[PDB]
Amino acid sequence: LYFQGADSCIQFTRHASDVLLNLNRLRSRDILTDVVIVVSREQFRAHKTVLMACSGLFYSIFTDQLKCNLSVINLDPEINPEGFCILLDFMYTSRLNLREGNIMAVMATAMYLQMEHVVDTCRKFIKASE
Amino acid sequence: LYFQGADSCIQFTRHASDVLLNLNRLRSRDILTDVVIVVSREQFRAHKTVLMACSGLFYSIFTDQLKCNLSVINLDPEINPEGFCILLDFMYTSRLNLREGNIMAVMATAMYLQMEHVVDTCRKFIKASE
Numbered sequence: 646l647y648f649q650g651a652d653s654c655i656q657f658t659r660h661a662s663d664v665l666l667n668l669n670r671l672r673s674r675d676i677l678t679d680v681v682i683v684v685s686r687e688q689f690r691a692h693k694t695v696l697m698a699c700s701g702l703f704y705s706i707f708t709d710q711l712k713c714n715l716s717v718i719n720l721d722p723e724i725n726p727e728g729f730c731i732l733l734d735f736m737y738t739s740r741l742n743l744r745e746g747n748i749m750a751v752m753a754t755a756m757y758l759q760m761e762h763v764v765d766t767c768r769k770f771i772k773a774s775e
Numbered sequence: 776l777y778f779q780g781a782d783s784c785i786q787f788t789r790h791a792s793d794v795l796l797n798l799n800r801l802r803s804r805d806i807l808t809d810v811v812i813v814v815s816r817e818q819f820r821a822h823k824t825v826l827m828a829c830s831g832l833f834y835s836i837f838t839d840q841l842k843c844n845l846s847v848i849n850l851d852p853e854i855n856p857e858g859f860c861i862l863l864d865f866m867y868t869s870r871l872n873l874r875e876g877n878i879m880a881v882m883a884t885a886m887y888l889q890m891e892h893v894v895d896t897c898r899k900f901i902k903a904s905e
């Protein structure tokens with residue numbers, strides 16, 4: 646349940662993962678979602694704070710004084726909606742569903758969103774298949 | 776960095792804790808905070824989604840159609856501000872700074888906020904000192 650942290654303070658082991666699980670439950674039920682991300686013909690509802698916490702691109706967008714208040718954000722029309730959906734799921738769960746058929750689109754999308762460890766992981770998996 | 780999850784899917788070990796760390800950085804910089812919690816003479820800015828993810832009381836409050844849009848939430852005047860501050864810090868970090876001088880107020884506050892594992896932990900630490 647808990648342990649003594651390096652700073653001699655009590656820390657709860659599953660707290661962060663349980664908070665992320667609850668944030669994903671709010672997303673699934675469309676509770677307190679405050680933005681819609683438009684990717685081509687697709688729309689994805691989400692929480693701006695989670696998007697900012699999980700992306701250099703969203704962090705830059707929502708810290709801009711003009712943009713921070715937009716309810717709709719349109720992504721570059723070159724972005725693959727399935728690649729975005731996989732990454733949005735990863736943001737809210739820590740699980741990255743990489744497959745042979747989606748890895749190029751996921752990698753291109755992670756580069757655009759500035760999710761650097763995800764890009765590096767995609768590169769390693771591609772390199773192993775070559 | 777990552778591992779094979781029980782569902783044969785790639786999982787990133789530090790993802791949840793790193794997201795929580797970024798949410799705490801947004802709180803420290805007052806970025807996208809959407810509510811002020813008033814406890815006696817004290818005010819605490821926060822994100823409603825994090826409060827809901829970390830409290831049965833806030834989950835009930837912000838799922839109410841009338842309340843979900845309030846920018847200010849006043850707590851019961853009996854609530855100790857330091858006890859609330861300690862729990863708000865715990866929500867955003869997983870670290871619970873329990874001390875002999877604050878444990879009764881932290882426990883009373885965790886009961887009011889419906890943070891049940893925190894209450895149980897407080898009870899065990901009190902029991903060990905008796």
Ligand SMILES: Cn1c(=O)c2c(c3cc(Nc4ccnc(F)c4Cl)ccc31)N[C@@H](C1CC1)C(F)(F)CO2
Nearest residue numbers: 697698699700701704759760761793794797800801
């Ligand atoms: C460049 N970059 C990533 O490469 C990145 C991010 C990432 C998040 C911010 N946001 C920050 C940064 C600082 N302070 C804040 F307050 C925020 Cl919100 C800025 C750049 C980022 N987030 C991780 C999340 C934490 C585990 C990710 F999902 F794995 C994708 O990787």
Ligand SMILES: Cn1c(=O)c2c(c3cc(Nc4ccnc(F)c4Cl)ccc31)N[C@@H](C1CC1)C(F)(F)CO2
Nearest residue numbers: 663664667670671827828829830831834889890891
């Ligand atoms: C009764 N109760 C706690 O006792 C509790 C909560 C807690 C959170 C919700 N919120 C929920 C529930 C279901 N689905 C949602 F979508 C939400 Cl947001 C509802 C009741 C809760 N949250 C944890 C966080 C996860 C690690 C806590 F901070 F440790 C304090 O303990």
Ligand SMILES: [Cl-]
Nearest residue numbers: 714715716717
């Ligand atoms: Cl808008």
Ligand SMILES: [Cl-]
Nearest residue numbers: 717718719720
């Ligand atoms: Cl736009």
Ligand SMILES: [Cl-]
Nearest residue numbers: 844845846847
């Ligand atoms: Cl209000």
Ligand SMILES: [Cl-]
Nearest residue numbers: 847848849850
């Ligand atoms: Cl109120």
